[PDB]
Design a protein around this ligand. Structure first.
Ligand SMILES: [Cu+2]
Ligand SMILES: [Cu+2]
Length: 463
């Protein structure tokens, strides 16, 4: 097996700048070359390291021949540097943004947000990571040797055409059910191995798929200890035997590594339309962990952090976000899926403006509301009316889930989150925006099933 690629961990130069170049190159998948896109390389991107209470400037060079944007998913930053679809970087141009980091330690990520084309640009290869640190987390003595016992694991599917190229299409089927493929990549590699020292291994898991939900576990049933969600540490580790991860979500987990017993991180079949087609009808390897008989120094602390109490609900502004899909797209897309794949597509289970929030397909020129700054709001997001999976993401914040798709959140999902599951039911989150976003650089709130976002299931909002 190839070794797990390790994204470079980037820090500022003396001018306090980090350089990101966006460009096209070549990757190989099963001995077949394919045009891919990457940040500082051919595919995926580096890990940008940030520190709470410090500012950094990122210089972003677009060397593609088409427009793109660079969005810092999970970052509490003003709209002007949020890199939403208004954050255009012209082909051959450069944009610089200053990130004033003011949130706890967490693993966030970054990716394009080009209007109507986010799914294609992610599918072509663009994604990177953000490692935020603070004073608190370093005192815990978690595993912390990047690329050895502290490793990012960005899991993504693709499909390829006969000629080896990435086979991306935004069409009536994928506008309904998402773009998904038959090949699983782990930091861009197919089923790599990672050599890890005896003791605890920390995995920073990212579901970077356009539309596929994942569910991590280990091949020999050793548990995973969840220590962090999208927005940072949980109050204490939560032991799980499986870990569902929606598109765009991150979790950090510790897993034990013992001498002489390799094991695989796997993903288990999920109950989402289209996603259990072989080989995803069975547990599927993500990577092999190869134990090395050197003692690892990291610890699994009994306590990690303090999560604040949930504030009173009475008197808060309620915002209702009703997701919907045009009944015609939904039917025609689901029909195409069933025709292509048959009953297995439900195992366990103009279109360009057909997906909507509050009866409107995304309108860049018109933010749907002004949210308040520095005050908690209760946002109620509903997917009643269809059966698709909508991981709903809100920019500019880390929120608390009050209700996730009609039930209190699981303990490892009860901390800081920037994504909440909406599927045929209703979720409620408690959200606060600490930063401004004017109409020219508004925040987005959208489904992170990218083909839904690109065909309308997004709104802009100001703060
Ligand atoms: Cu985001
Ligand atoms: Cu959706």
């Amino acid at each position: 097996r190839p070794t797990l690629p390790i994204p470079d961990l980037l820090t500022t130069d003396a001018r306090n700048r980090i350089q990101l170049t966006i460009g096209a190159g070549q990757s190989t998948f099963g001995g077949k070359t394919a045009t891919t896109w990457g940040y500082n390389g051919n595919l995926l991107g580096p890990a940008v390291k940030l520190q709470r209470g410090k500012a950094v400037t990122v210089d972003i060079y677009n060397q593609l021949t088409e427009e793109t944007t660079l969005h810092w998913h999970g970052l509490e930053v003003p709209g002007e540097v949020d890199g939403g679809p208004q954050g255009i970087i012209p082909p051959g141009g450069k944009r610089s943004v200053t990130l004033n980091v003011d949130q706890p330690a967490a693993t966030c990520w970054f990716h394009p947000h080009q209007h109507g084309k986010t799914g294609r640009q992610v599918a072509m290869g663009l994604a990177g990571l953000v490692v935020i640190e603070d004073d608190e987390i370093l005192k815990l003595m978690l595993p912390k040797q990047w690329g050895i016992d502290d490793v990012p694991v960005i899991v993504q599917d693709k499909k390829f055409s006969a000629d080896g190229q990435i086979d991306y299409q935004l069409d009536v089927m994928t506008a309904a059910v998402g773009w998904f493929g038959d090949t699983l990549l782990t930091n861009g590699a197919i089923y790599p191995q990672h050599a890890a020292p005896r003791g605890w291994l920390r995995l920073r898991l990212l579901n970077g798929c356009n539309a596929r939900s994942l569910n991590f576990a280990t091949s020999d049933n050793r548990p995973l200890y969840v220590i962090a969600s999208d927005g940072g540490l949980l109050p204490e580790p939560v032991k799980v035997s499986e870990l569902p991860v929606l598109m765009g979500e991150r979790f950090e987990v510790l897993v034990e590594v013992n001498d002489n017993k390799p094991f695989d991180l796997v993903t288990l079949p999920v109950s989402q339309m289209g996603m259990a087609i072989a080989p995803f009808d069975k547990p599927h390897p993500v990577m092999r962990i190869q134990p090395i008989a050197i003692s690892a120094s990291g610890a699994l602390p009994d306590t990690l952090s303090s999560l604040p109490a949930l504030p009173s609900l009475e008197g808060l502004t309620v915002r209702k976000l009703q997701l919907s899909m045009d009944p015609m797209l939904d039917m025609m897309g689901m029909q195409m899926l069933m025709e292509k794949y048959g009953d297995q597509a439900m195992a366990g289970m103009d279109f360009h403006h057909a997906n909507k929030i509050n009866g409107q397909a995304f309108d860049m020129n018109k933010p749907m509301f002004a949210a308040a700054k520095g005050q908690y709001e209760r946002w109620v997001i509903s997917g009643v009316g269809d059966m698709m999976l909508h991981p709903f993401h809100i920019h500019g914040t880390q929120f608390r889930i009050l209700s996730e798709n009609g039930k209190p959140p699981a303990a490892h999902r009860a901390g800081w989150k920037d994504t909440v599951k909406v599927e045929g039911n209703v979720s409620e989150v408690l959200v606060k925006f600490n930063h401004d976003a004017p109409k020219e650089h508004a925040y987005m709130a959208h489904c992170h099933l990218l083909e839904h976002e690109d065909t309308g299931m997004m709104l802009g909002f100001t703060v």
